């Protein structure tokens, strides 16, 4: 089958500045009747891919000028002139020239944004799980930027670390922050023996770190 | 104009087959080929085959004798009938014309042994203790259940713009994720603010009322 490889992997931009997406194919993918069947896609969080270029340069109606495709035998480029917020997204080539046809891995474009600091809330667990035997404990750090954070859960100050389990999102489109959840999970057992339950966030933002904390 | 739409199972058992459905809305089905395509864990996009408006098929060679898809012209719809599932079966489906024009929403499958486990919806109010802010955040946590997906509304979608809906994480073979919502203070207790969660594997919907710790 014909193998098509994308690169790079990941890759992040400024509102404005221009983007390059590559994908290599194994072999020519000039069909016999002499047309080139490399077609490009994009999809967003929670969406079905979207096609923007068909037949390696050809563009559909009602995408952007931005967007334009290049290249030709096996080495074809996807390339967004000016990008908008909106732009966030994986994106993806695809021949249909040989059968079966076949898809690239994807690319995921990422935004450039001012940085910014998490709003951290933490949460006591709810009467209703108490009552079923267990105990979780969560913790919220929203809007923030750059996505690299860390979040340290602490018993009566002593510092633990099994039993926690983490979540990030994915990168806004509307304001390219990010967002994330973590989650102390404990028997009804181990958390009453207890007092002091805290959450703390250390971020680009500061050099002290952000504090929640509740006692029973 | 050209609107996909698939439908079938969340969860089927290793050996048995998978079946689902294609029902498009604007044109005729006699007028383009058709398609299915699953997307894996990983995002990685497998085309599976196509059906031309005569009944003749393509099929992947990847799905050794496994597929068939053909169709129901008068209802204007086609189907999917996959063999012998195993858990590399498990995927998000995806029905479009053959060059992928038009696409569905997609739908999620899983393919396990394992039994269905609704998820247990706990409410998240901040401690008894509080108040400067201007704004406050509540949340809802879906914990333990099988299979994927869940959806969460929060007052039926009327609530938007200050919604975040982690991911599901995996503990001990079961699914638990999270949702927050933020209002002005003035909004909550005042008015009711209830999160709306679905799990279709086992039927569930269910609303969850936030109250005030007191």
């Known amino acids: 089958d014909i193998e098509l490889t994308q690169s790079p992997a990941t890759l992040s931009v400024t509102p404005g500045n221009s983007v390059s997406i590559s994908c290599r194919a194994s072999?020519?993918?000039?069909?016999?009747?002499?047309?080139?069947?490399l077609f490009w896609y994009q999809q967003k969080s929670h969406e079905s891919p979207r096609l923007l270029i068909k037949y390696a340069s050809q563009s559909i109606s009602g995408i952007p000028s931005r967007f334009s495709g290049s290249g030709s035998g096996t080495d074809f480029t996807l390339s967004i002139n000016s990008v908008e917020t909106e732009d966030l997204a994986v994106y993806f080539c695809?021949?249909?020239?040989?059968?079966?046809?076949?898809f690239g891995g994807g690319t995921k474009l990422e935004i450039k944004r001012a940085d910014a600091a998490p709003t951290v809330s933490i949460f006591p667990p709810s009467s209703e799980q108490l009552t079923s035997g267990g105990a979780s404990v969560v913790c919220f750090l929203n809007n923030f930027y750059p996505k690299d954070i860390n979040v340290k859960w602490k018993i009566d100050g002593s510092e633990r670390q099994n039993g926690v389990l983490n979540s990030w999102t994915d990168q806004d489109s509307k304001d390219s922050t990010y967002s994330m959840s973590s989650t102390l999970t404990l028997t009804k057992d181990e958390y009453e023996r207890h007092n002091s339950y805290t959450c703390e966030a250390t971020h680009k933002t500061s050099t002290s770190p952000i504090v929640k904390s509740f006692n029973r | 104009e050209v609107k996909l739409q698939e439908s079938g199972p969340s969860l089927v058992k290793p050996s048995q087959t998978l079946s689902l459905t294609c029902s498009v809305t604007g044109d005729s089905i006699t007028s383009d080929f058709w398609s299915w395509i699953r997307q894996f864990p990983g995002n990685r996009l497998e085309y599976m085959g196509f059906?031309?408006?005569?009944?003749?098929?393509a099929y992947n060679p990847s799905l050794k004798s496994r597929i068939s898809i053909t169709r129901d012209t008068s209802k204007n719809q086609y189907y999917l009938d996959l063999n012998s599932v195993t858990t590399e079966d498990t995927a998000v489906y995806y029905c479009?014309?053959?060059?992928?024009?038009?696409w569905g929403q997609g739908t999620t499958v899983t393919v396990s042994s394992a039994k269905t486990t609704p998820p247990s919806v706990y409410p998240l109010a901040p401690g008894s203790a509080a108040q400067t802010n201007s704004m406050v955040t509540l949340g809802c946590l879906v914990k333990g259940y099988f299979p994927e997906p869940v959806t969460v509304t929060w007052n039926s979608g009327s609530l938007s713009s200050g919604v975040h809906t982690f991911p599901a994480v995996l503990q001990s073979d079961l699914y638990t994720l999270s949702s927050s919502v933020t209002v002005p203070s003035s909004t909550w207790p005042s008015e009711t603010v209830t999160c709306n969660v679905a799990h279709p594997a086992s039927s569930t919907k269910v609303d969850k009322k936030i109250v005030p710790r007191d």
């Open positions: 479009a014309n053959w060059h992928g024009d038009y």
């Open positions: 059906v031309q408006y005569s009944g003749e098929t």
């Open positions: 072999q020519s993918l000039v069909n016999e009747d002499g047309n080139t069947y």
């Open positions: 695809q021949q249909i020239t040989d059968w079966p046809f076949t």
